[PDB]
Design a protein around this ligand. Structure first.
Ligand SMILES: O=C(O)/C=C(\C=C(/O)C(=O)O)C(=O)O
Length: 294
């Protein structure tokens, strides 16, 4: 254990109110909880030790920004121990669903227990700066024995997309891509990375993506105009396959801490019409995470 003070703050403690008002039932489909470490320790394999960011803080943020629901995504700092994430879902009293990280050896019963606890998929992280090992064969095997209706969430960088194509084509359930596979948004909406990512989207009908993280992808900083110009055409072209999230509490972003109000204000830039906003924030995430309500 490290004290909270000793650990890394990566979020804005007093974020601006967004100028944009999200519609009723809006889902922040990419967020995390960290600890609280006193009850839920970090993984021995964690590559960062963040400050506590618990459910009460997450819900306060959710309310402040005007969102109705969250998808709480197991963070790499907690490894395959989903306890913190599971506790947050429990505390959300129905307003949250989850994504887990699992030992590929996890048994049928343990997966069932994760489903009851509100998980609707598992995450595969191909960023070496976050996770050392990524056994594709084992990943494929676990993906083939998930509870009915689960998907897989995949996080990778643009420079390994081509290498990952055979793996992704073999995944036997739907796929959600974190942060569009980190394209270089400086290139424009028809740049090399976006062309490659579109080839991936065009290969299977059931690949969804998060149109997220201008803070991570656009080194100019706010208003992140390159992200806006490069991402908006992608949203428009794949309107039925796009979801969105804040990425709060922004692990690893301590050197460029984003204002969540500004993060939310990207929404009407990449989704300029009411219909696009409703698809990205309500209809699409509902089909993935609350299909029983659709
Ligand atoms: O969580 C994200 O969306 C982004 C990052 C962190 C993780 O993926 C994680 O630790 O689980 C990152 O890019 O550092």
């Amino acid at each position: 254990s490290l004290t909270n003070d000793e650990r890394i703050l990566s979020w804005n403690e007093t974020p601006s109110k967004p100028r944009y008002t999200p519609p009723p039932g809006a889902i922040d489909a990419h967020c995390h909880v960290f600890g609280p470490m006193a009850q839920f320790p970090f993984s021995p394999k964690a590559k960062y030790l963040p400050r506590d960011a618990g459910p009460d803080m997450l819900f306060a943020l959710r309310d402040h920004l005007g969102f109705a629901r969250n998808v709480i995504v197991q963070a790499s700092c907690h490894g395959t121990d989903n306890a913190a994430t599971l506790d947050a879902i429990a505390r959300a009293q129905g307003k949250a669903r989850g994504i887990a990280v699992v030992d590929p050896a996890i048994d049928e019963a343990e997966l069932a227990a994760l489903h009851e606890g509100g998980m609707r998929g598992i995450r595969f992280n191909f960023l070496k700066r976050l996770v050392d090992d990524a056994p594709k064969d084992k990943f494929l095997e676990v993906a083939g024995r998930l509870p009915a209706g689960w998907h897989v969430v995949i996080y990778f960088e643009a420079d390994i997309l081509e290498e990952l194509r055979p793996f992704m084509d073999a995944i036997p359930v739907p796929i959600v891509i974190d942060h569009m596979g980190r394209p270089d948004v400086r290139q424009g909406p028809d740049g090399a990375d976006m062309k490659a990512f579109r080839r991936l989207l065009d290969s299977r009908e059931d690949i969804w993506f998060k149109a997220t993280c201008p803070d991570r992808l656009d080194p100019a900083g706010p208003p992140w105009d390159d992200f806006a110009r490069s991402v908006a055409p992608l949203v428009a072209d794949y309107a039925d396959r796009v979801i969105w999230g804040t990425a709060w509490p922004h692990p690893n972003m301590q050197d460029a801490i984003p204002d969540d109000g500004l993060v939310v204000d990207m929404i009407p830039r990449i989704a300029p019409t009411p219909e696009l906003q409703h698809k990205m924030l309500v209809t699409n995430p509902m089909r993935l995470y609350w299909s029983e309500e659709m």
